[PDB]
Design a protein around this nucleic acid. Structure first.
Ligand SMILES: [Mg+2]
Ligand SMILES: [Mg+2]
Ligand SMILES: [Mg+2]
Ligand SMILES: [Mg+2]
Ligand SMILES: [Mg+2]
Ligand SMILES: [Mg+2]
Ligand SMILES: [Mg+2]
Ligand SMILES: [Mg+2]
Ligand SMILES: [Mg+2]
Ligand SMILES: [Mg+2]
Ligand SMILES: [Mg+2]
Ligand SMILES: [Mg+2]
Ligand SMILES: [Mg+2]
Ligand SMILES: [Mg+2]
Ligand SMILES: [Mg+2]
Ligand SMILES: [Mg+2]
Ligand SMILES: [Mg+2]
Ligand SMILES: [Mg+2]
Ligand SMILES: [Mg+2]
Ligand SMILES: [Mg+2]
Ligand SMILES: [Mg+2]
Ligand SMILES: [Mg+2]
Ligand SMILES: [Mg+2]
Ligand SMILES: [Mg+2]
Ligand SMILES: [Mg+2]
Ligand SMILES: [Mg+2]
Ligand SMILES: [Mg+2]
Ligand SMILES: [Mg+2]
Ligand SMILES: [Mg+2]
Ligand SMILES: [Mg+2]
Ligand SMILES: [Mg+2]
Ligand SMILES: [Mg+2]
Ligand SMILES: [Mg+2]
Ligand SMILES: [Mg+2]
Ligand SMILES: [Mg+2]
Ligand SMILES: [Mg+2]
Ligand SMILES: [Mg+2]
Ligand SMILES: [Mg+2]
Ligand SMILES: [Mg+2]
Ligand SMILES: [Mg+2]
Ligand SMILES: [Mg+2]
Ligand SMILES: [Mg+2]
Ligand SMILES: [Mg+2]
Ligand SMILES: [Mg+2]
Ligand SMILES: [Mg+2]
Ligand SMILES: [Mg+2]
Ligand SMILES: [Mg+2]
Ligand SMILES: [Mg+2]
Ligand SMILES: [Mg+2]
Ligand SMILES: [Mg+2]
Ligand SMILES: [Mg+2]
Ligand SMILES: [Mg+2]
Ligand SMILES: [Mg+2]
Ligand SMILES: [Mg+2]
Ligand SMILES: [Mg+2]
Ligand SMILES: [Mg+2]
Ligand SMILES: [Mg+2]
Ligand SMILES: [Mg+2]
Ligand SMILES: [Mg+2]
Ligand SMILES: [Mg+2]
Lengths: 61, 92, 101, 60
RNA sequence: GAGCUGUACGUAAGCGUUGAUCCAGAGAUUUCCGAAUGGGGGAACCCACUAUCUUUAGUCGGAUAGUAUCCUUACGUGAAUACAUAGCGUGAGGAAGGCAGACCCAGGGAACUGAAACAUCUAAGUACCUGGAGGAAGAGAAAGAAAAAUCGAUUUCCUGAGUAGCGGCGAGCGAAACGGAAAGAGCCCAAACCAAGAAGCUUGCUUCUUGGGGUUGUAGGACACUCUAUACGGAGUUACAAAAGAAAGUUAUAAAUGAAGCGGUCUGGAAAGGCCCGCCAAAGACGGUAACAGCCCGGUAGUUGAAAUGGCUUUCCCUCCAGAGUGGAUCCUGAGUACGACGGAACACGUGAAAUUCCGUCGGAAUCCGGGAGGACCAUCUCCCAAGGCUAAAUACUCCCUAGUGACCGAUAGUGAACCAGUACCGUGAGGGAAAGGUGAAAAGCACCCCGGAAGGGGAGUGAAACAGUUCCUGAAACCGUGUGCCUA
RNA sequence: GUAUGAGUAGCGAAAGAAGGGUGAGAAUCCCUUCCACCGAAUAUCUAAGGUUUCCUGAGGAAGGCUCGUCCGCUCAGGGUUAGUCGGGACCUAAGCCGAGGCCGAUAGGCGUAGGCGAUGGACAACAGGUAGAGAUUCCUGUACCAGUGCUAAUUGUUUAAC
RNA sequence: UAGGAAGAGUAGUACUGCCCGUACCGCAAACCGACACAGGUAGAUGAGGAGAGAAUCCUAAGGUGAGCGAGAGAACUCUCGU
């Protein structure tokens, strides 16, 4: 991503980052229960958030 | 922390599920989260009305896997009960 | 590694000397390649969920890369590999001219 | 901190001798006297030696 | 440029030629403790105040910054006490702690031991404690060395030399100059004098600050004059004043290309080996590959390569600058200082005929018509100007990084540690401190049958080998057994 | 590393018996009856200390001075719920630290304000239930302590409610 | 009392109340003694008959049968009885 992220005006990227943590909590909820089969989604959701915290930080220098 | 950072995952066991019908839900929370933070974290995520929270701390068990000795993570377990005039949480 | 995955090969040394086959896998961390029909093994496998019949199975085994020389399409002979660049993309060429590989 | 505040002489160490030249260990102290002089814009009580005090100092 | 999600065998779920994993440069994030610094504390924990914001009907909650002590300094307030100081508060700079068990400077400073006992002496200014640093430290530009003639700042190496000396003249301690080399470099203040101010008003004075001038021994400078010069030229951030900025080249930190045998044949599980033929070489270093490879692989010689960051050299930019001679009225050239008495120490030198340097305490100079030294001291002569400061290289060491070497070790050896080693274990604690390497080329790690609950065996199979089967290459001796040829109540 | 002593000393105060069960295997495990021992304890709580030894399901290589189907042993999952109990957000003793400060070759020693520090002072909950493991904690019933908002009335506004 | 003061009490209702410990042994096979060791370990409760008594003997509630056995009934050693 990254280059796709940079086309967002530092406010919707706050909303996209917020909506990713909602998914991450739900994914951890099903893994504990035993209802998750695509366990590879755990790691790429985490790295999607870290990819957005970096763009916001470097934008404010 | 955030609401999603205070609460980590549910506890699904024989003791934990025997009280679901009593409107009591068992979670694993952050080690440094107070009883009051857990109350407002639940209402933000599930939009239920919370009546009580009870917390307890667990040590780490000494475990061995061959010539190597160590400890498991220490846990903080919270049990949340809700008011009768409120929705339910589906562990499912 | 000088041999990629999925190209024709001639075996230079070993008990299967003189034969040929394709490359099915490559393990650059240990300098091994797995080639069809070469270095068959008979492993005595206990029955389990996978392969419920068990039995004695003929499966390939990896061999060292140095026992391997790539075969050119110009004359079908084991040739050494040379590296040449065509603009932005590098290609492999045989020492015996033999166009690109 | 027991030393003269002008010429910073203080305790030193040396030997103590006798007949038959048996060597013990002793020390040499300075002749420090506590006086009130204008060490700054205001007077104060400080250690001053009796030798730095014979030419040109303050009220003493 | 084709695989990847570490050890880690493997299950699942996935990611990659729209170029992942990987390697290098530069960034971002960086819980809690720890100098730990908002207060406390039994280590990684507990409890806050102030300001803003946020949530609830409100209490309860949450987020973001500030809040330690001391030194220097600016401002505001401000006691006995009238002015004022102490004190108090706010703002801005600096410090604190660690270590490389190494090198070196200073403060403090043993004993065992030797003297065939022991006290002066030695061990020794060693071990150790404390403080200060630096990449080096210390010393350093003559009040010097030396003697019928001279040298010209320190430091280190070779000699002088186990010499001259010191020494219950015992055990022992033990120089320096000349001579030969490595490296080379010189400077800035204080004071007379000049200009400016302020204070004490000692009242037309001294005494504090600022700038200029000046730093030496044939004495020099001030001061009077002659000459030039204010950037013509010269120098510079390693001392000589100090802070920055560009360009070019080089180098370090990833890498690219890179010659020549699938040659024939024998033994063999397997050829790199034997025999018979070719070739490359600025490449016959090293390692791997099923036994010993210049021509199989990674590479090697050679030739190339850097977006980014650090280093170095040069240049530009920038910055700053007076130096020659003649006189000598008069003025200046480091004061409780140099020295001396008393008590100690360092000098190779133990108070000795004891020069020289330093410390504590008393006394206490001259100042150019002057002062010090030449191993007590006096006279002559010679050499030199103390009581202020700075200074690169030649020298010492290695916790580290890169490339290499060894008539160095090879698992009781070599680091205590070739293996999850300062670990297990021992102690209240400081602290002490091990044992433990090898299946096979490749897990191909024994499907299946029989005895047995299992362990373990006997076949079968893999393998060159299973008398290589999970302390598994080789497998000695002690020690334990079974069978038997000769002897023995 | 392995022998001799040598199948020798020892197997750490004590009363057990029989009948069923499980199991490849029983003096040693489970159940039943009888008998015996402690009973100001060998009974019931609770501090210190120890840190998972607690519960359930499997196991029998090593540990258990014999045996083991068993275990405080091995493996895998679980289990500790507080406004009122004990401690902190309350208080201080002995003692300890200690801004300035006084001493002192260095390092540091002592000490005022101030602060830590229970073994003591102050402080609001009781009775039942819970068939694997927690109970003044969870559940039922009835309470108390401190605070907050809201509704209805009361009172007072600077000679000044509180 | 010094001080602060336009808000204050009253009644009824509803809501709010943080952190650490809590398992298990605890005169013991789980603590201190190298041991599943005849030793040591603060405090609260601690029944009946006879009894002055927490002495002594036998018992209650409750808890135990002690982690090698059986069989013979020699010398000698130890602890007991005539
Ligand atoms: Mg609790
Ligand atoms: Mg003092
Ligand atoms: Mg703090
Ligand atoms: Mg502190
Ligand atoms: Mg320091
Ligand atoms: Mg002697
Ligand atoms: Mg000495
Ligand atoms: Mg030091
Ligand atoms: Mg430095
Ligand atoms: Mg220096
Ligand atoms: Mg190449
Ligand atoms: Mg080549
Ligand atoms: Mg053959
Ligand atoms: Mg050959
Ligand atoms: Mg070689
Ligand atoms: Mg090969
Ligand atoms: Mg071999
Ligand atoms: Mg080899
Ligand atoms: Mg003297
Ligand atoms: Mg003197
Ligand atoms: Mg003279
Ligand atoms: Mg001389
Ligand atoms: Mg002389
Ligand atoms: Mg110097
Ligand atoms: Mg060793
Ligand atoms: Mg060996
Ligand atoms: Mg210990
Ligand atoms: Mg077998
Ligand atoms: Mg078997
Ligand atoms: Mg066989
Ligand atoms: Mg065979
Ligand atoms: Mg071998
Ligand atoms: Mg062997
Ligand atoms: Mg043998
Ligand atoms: Mg015997
Ligand atoms: Mg006997
Ligand atoms: Mg017994
Ligand atoms: Mg405890
Ligand atoms: Mg148990
Ligand atoms: Mg046994
Ligand atoms: Mg069984
Ligand atoms: Mg069992
Ligand atoms: Mg267990
Ligand atoms: Mg309650
Ligand atoms: Mg309390
Ligand atoms: Mg202090
Ligand atoms: Mg003190
Ligand atoms: Mg006090
Ligand atoms: Mg306290
Ligand atoms: Mg108490
Ligand atoms: Mg109470
Ligand atoms: Mg219980
Ligand atoms: Mg309990
Ligand atoms: Mg026992
Ligand atoms: Mg006992
Ligand atoms: Mg009692
Ligand atoms: Mg009784
Ligand atoms: Mg009675
Ligand atoms: Mg009684
Ligand atoms: Mg009885």
């Amino acid at each position: 991503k990254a280059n796709d992220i940079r086309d967002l005006s530092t406010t919707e990227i706050q909303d996209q980052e917020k909506a990713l943590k909602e998914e991450l909590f739900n994914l951890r909820f099903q893994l504990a229960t035993g209802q998750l089969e695509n366990t590879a989604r755990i790691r790429e959701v985490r790295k999607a958030i870290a990819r957005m915290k970096t763009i916001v930080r470097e934008r404010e220098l | 922390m955030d609401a999603r950072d205070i609460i980590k995952r549910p506890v699904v066991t024989e003791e934990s599920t025997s009280i679901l019908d009593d409107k009591k839900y068992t979670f694993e929370v952050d080690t440094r989260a107070t009883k009051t933070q857990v109350k407002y974290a639940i209402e933000e995520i599930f939009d239920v009305k919370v009546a009580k929270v009870n917390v307890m701390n667990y040590k780490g068990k000494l475990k061995r896997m061959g010539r190597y000795a160590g400890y498991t993570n220490k846990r903080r377990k919270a049990i949340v009960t809700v008011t009768a005039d409120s929705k339910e949480i589906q562990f499912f | 590694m000088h041999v990629k995955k999925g190209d024709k090969v001639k075996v230079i040394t070993g008990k299967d000397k003189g034969k040929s086959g394709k490359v099915l896998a490559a393990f650059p961390k240990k300098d091994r390649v797995l080639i069809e029909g070469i270095n068959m093994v008979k492993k005595h496998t206990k029955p389990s969920n996978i392969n419920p019949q068990g039995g004695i199975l003929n499966v390939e085994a990896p061999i060292h890369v140095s026992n391997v020389m790539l075969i050119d399409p110009k004359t079908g002979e084991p040739t050494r590999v040379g590296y040449e660049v065509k603009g932005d993309k590098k290609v492999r060429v045989a020492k015996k001219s033999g166009e690109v590989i | 901190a027991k030393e003269c505040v002008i010429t910073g002489r203080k305790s030193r160490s040396g030997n103590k001798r006798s007949h038959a030249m048996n060597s013990s260990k002793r020390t040499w102290k300075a002749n420090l006297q506590k006086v009130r002089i204008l060490v700054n814009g205001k007077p104060k009580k400080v250690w001053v030696s009796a030798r730095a005090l014979k030419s040109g100092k303050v009220e003493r």
